[PDB]
Structure 1
Amino acid sequence: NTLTVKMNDALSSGTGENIGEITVSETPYGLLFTPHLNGLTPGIHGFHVHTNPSCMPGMKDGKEVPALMAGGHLDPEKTGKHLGPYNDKGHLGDLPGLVVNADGTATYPLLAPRLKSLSELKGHSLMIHKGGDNYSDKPAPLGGGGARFACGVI
């Protein structure tokens, strides 16, 4: 009745350390992402479903990009807007920001009400960014998440 997603650090070199898992469950109000992660910087981290089932690095615009092969934020409706987990006008893959505790662990459960079934996650990937997520494309694109820190294929 649940999915367990192993998350690993993303380097320009390839894949890095395993930093734990995220357990995805179904609730009457949407999918609940319960992290069991370690080794993250305290604070709020951008957290999204990406289109492709890969965490491999790649080259873009002559720049090394960790976990580039995951593609962009999951966007089956082709909205082209990053508007967060509570706005149906943006990427379906926009999840609530990941909450990292003072000791670098992540445990606080995150409800994504726009996702209703675990079947919607199959063939995709989960991404944790270095920066946060203000659920907007301003003042920074894609909520300000920036580089990809960790990634896991579903």
Structure 2
Amino acid sequence: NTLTVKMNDALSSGTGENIGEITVSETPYGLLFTPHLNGLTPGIHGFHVHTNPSCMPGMKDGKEVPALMAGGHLDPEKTGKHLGPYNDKGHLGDLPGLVVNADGTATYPLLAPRLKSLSELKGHSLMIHKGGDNYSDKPAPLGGGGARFACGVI
């Protein structure tokens, strides 16, 4: 049982290059996200599930913002707080930071214990930000992920 999520670079002018795909599976402890991607800045990237089934860019006060139409972080309990994949009090869509190797690839598997079923990701999207994620709204909001680099509807 799997979900193959294709990921594409998000541009302010639209959808860019494909950079691989992410395969999600169920384990006795939660959903496992096993990436197979390339062309990413080495390091740890914010990685979250967003509300809307779209990666389309959008205008914000007159400026085009990449993958803006994705909406915010999946948060069916309107917590309104970014606390990470290990805190039952924040965004349910908060996944562990994506690990990007030194050669630009991402292969390290990520476990999101709070997510249990493949039906929970239906009608949403997976996002990879430019920045990292400190699993909090301080000092920088939303973990400090900043701009949206790549996105997948799934």
**Common topology (TM > 0.5):** yes
RMSD: 0.4
Alignment check: 8 A CA contact 2:13 2:64 kept:
no
Per-residue deviation, 1:61: 2.3
- Greater than 4 Å deviation, 4+ residue runs: none
Report which stretch shifted further, 26-35 or 60-69. 60-69
CA distance in 1, matches of 2:126, 2:109: 15
- Quote how far apart the aligned CAs of 1:112 are: 0.2
Does the 8 Å CA contact 2:45/2:133 hold for their aligned counterparts?
yes
Cα-to-partner distance string for 1:94-137 (whole Å, 9 max, x where unaligned): 00000000000000000000000000000000000000000000
Q: Secondary structure at the match of 2:143?
A: helix
Residue aligned with 1:34, SS:
strand
Q: Is the 8 Å Cα contact of residues 45 and 97 (structure 2) preserved in structure 1?
A: yes
The SS at the match of 2:114 is coil
CA distance in 2, matches of 1:61, 1:93: 26
Deviation at 1:64, TM superposition (A): 1.6
Encode CA deviations 1:30-67: one digit per residue, 9 max, x unaligned: 00000000000000000000000000000112222100
Instruction: List aligned pairs for 1:1-154, cutoff 5 A.
Output: 1-154=1-154
Identity of aligned residues (%): 100
Give the secondary-structure state (helix, strand or coil) at the position aligned to 1:120.
Answer: coil
TM-score (norm 2): 0.99
In structure 1, C-alpha distance between the alignment counterparts of 2:62 and 2:91, rounded to whole Å: 26
Greater Cα offset, 84-93 or 56-65: 56-65
- Which digits, 9 at most, give the CA deviation of each residue in 1:3-45, with x for residues without a partner? 0000000000100000000000000000000000000000000
> 2: distance between equivalents of 1:3 and 1:60?
32
CA distance in 2, matches of 1:82, 1:62: 27
Inter-partner Cα distance in structure 1 for 2:81 and 2:126: 18
